[PDB]
Amino acid sequence: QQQIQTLVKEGLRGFREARRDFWRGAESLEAALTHNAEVPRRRAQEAEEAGAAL
Amino acid sequence: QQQIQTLVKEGLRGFREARRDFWRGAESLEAALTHNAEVPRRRAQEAEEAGAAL
Secondary structure, three states, X not given: OOOHHHHHHHOOHHHHHHHHHHXXXXXXXXXXXXXXXXXXXXXXXXXXXXXXXX | OOXXXXXXXXXXXXXXXXXXXXXHHHHHHHXXXXXXXXXXXXXXXXXXXXHHHO
């Protein structure tokens, strides 16, 4: 109950916190790499706006 | 015929060359100051294009 129960119950919990927050970061970065890429060549205000999001 | 005829005939001729070329420069600069001023605030490719003409 000290070691193995605690580990199963609440010993993976901050690894799983960090991992879901971390893949959330890459979800948003995957989306903003797309966003960064949808910039027309003529544009400059869209370029700095897209690039700030990236 | 040496001095006063020559001066009347062809003695003002390079002053008048320089002056009409010079007011021509300011005609085009008056027009390009207008041109420089017709730039929408959103724009950056129009800004550098207008500004190069100025």
